Each structure stands twice: as C-alpha cells, then as structure tokens.
Amino acid sequence: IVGGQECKDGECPWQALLINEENEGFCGGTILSEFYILTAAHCLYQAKRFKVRVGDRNTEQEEGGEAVHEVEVVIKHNRFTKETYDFDIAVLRLKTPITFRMNVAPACLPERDWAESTLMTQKTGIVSGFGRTHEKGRQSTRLKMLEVPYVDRNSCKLSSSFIITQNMFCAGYDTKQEDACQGDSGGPHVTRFKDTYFVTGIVSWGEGCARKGKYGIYTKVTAFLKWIDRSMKT
Amino acid sequence: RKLCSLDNGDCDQFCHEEQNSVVCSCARGYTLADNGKACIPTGPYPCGKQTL
C-alpha cells in the first residue's frame, strides 16, 4: 500500500496473508468465514506451497494474535485467464477453522443487487495489505489500509491500456500518490455501510503503482457472489 | 427517491422492494430485529465488524 495509514488494533480483522516456504507474504486474502479465504486466482502461481496467516499487523513482532493455517483445497475460477486477468478470483478452504478474536474476523458478503446499487455507489472503498509502500520499494512490515475512491467506469476504460472486463472495476486516484502495490494482490477491498464492512473487491492489477493517469484494478466481487457461495458449500 | 432508494429504506443492511414496499434483511450471522429493519449479531465476532 502506497500512502494510506497503518491498520490500528482491530481495524482490519478480515485481512489474510498468503505466506510462502520462507514465511514471507506474497499475496493478501480476505477472511470470509472460519474455513474460507477469498484471494486472486493469479496469486496461486507465485508459490508452489503456501499457508495462510491471520491476525498479523507487524511481521517483525509476535503480538499474540497471529495464527497460521494450512490450505486443504484451492478453488480457482476455471475461466481465469493469465492473458487478461479476467475472472481473477479463487477461494481457499482451510484444513483447520479460524478462531475469531481481536484482529481476526470475517468481512461480510453482500447480496449482488444491493451491493451494486448501494455499496458500489458510495464515494470510497478501503483496500489493505502488506504490499510495497512505493513502486520500487520493499514489502511493508506493517499492515496498511487506504481509502480509495470508486472510479467512473468510462473514465477507467479511457485510462487503461488494457481491457477492463465486466469482472473488473477501478478504484483509486488519477494523480494522488496513493494506491495498492506489489504484494497487496488478492487482498481485501471492502466498503463500509453503517459501520459494517462488506467485501466488494479483490486487489488484482495495475499499470505500476500510483502512476499518473492510472487506477487500481480490482476483481468485481459482486459478479461472483453465486460462484463464491457454491465454492463455500464444497 | 422511494423505498430502498430513500435512505436504504431505513434498513441496517440489505434492502429489497417487494410488492411495492421495503423488505430488509441481513448478512449471515445477523438476525433481523423485531422492527424488521435493524440487524443484530447472532453470536460473537459477526462479519464486517472491527474488533473491540
């Protein structure tokens, strides 16, 4: 996350971190339930073996809330394409259930129509992760969050050198130096409504980080709510 | 602005227009309150809530 602020105690409890063999984060995730993590399908090629860590805010200290979980099943969307990043979504079933506590809780899944009409028409969403704090920098040791404006769909298509499919939406800033970045992929994009946070996106891709005339591209969770529901039933 | 278009139909969460009237509902882990509008967590750590 470029710009934004640190997630403070209890503020980003649905954040998951996909960790490789070296116990280093490479992607984010969103806790959906005690057994399921939402992530990007493209994250599933960046490590041969990975686990999921929850309840972490500082990768340099043991704060007592951290928990590592092994993955039992990887459910990648079968229509995911590396060419365009269309259908960039996957669900992970954990081997053991997550025990909710301080810094560990799920984000809510909304209903499609209401989310499109009421959540996606709000001014902003919130993206979070342990990703780079500058385009050329190292991964953050601290969990960060950033308020990102929803971007007009036409403006986004106009800004993009590549196809924005029906399964994608744009968020962030034209010139302001704030955006998601490398390592934030697969992480949460949530929208607040009356003090309740609903999953609205998955950090997907961008032409660099925080570049002028460029926005962050997110998987449109509302297009995949039935798919998610099915994946979580088996 | 009418029904769900007017202040989310007074619903805490989901709003549906059925038979030209507002119907409120809630995410899993919440129960619709007796007023048929508010959403009450059914147990500890409900979805979408920051902790403590």
Ligand SMILES: CN(C)[C@@H]1CCc2cc(N3CC[C@H](NS(=O)(=O)c4ccc5cc(Cl)ccc5c4)C3=O)ccc21
């Ligand atoms: C080619 N096609 C599959 C699509 C369309 C163009 C494109 C660009 C990228 N890139 C190019 C580099 C960038 N990497 S990153 O680590 O800086 C990164 C990764 C994810 C991001 C996500 C958001 Cl929301 C914002 C900025 C982000 C930045 C990144 O994600 C990946 C896929 C695709």
Ligand SMILES: [Ca+2]
């Ligand atoms: Ca820690």
Ligand SMILES: [Mg+2]
């Ligand atoms: Mg920009």
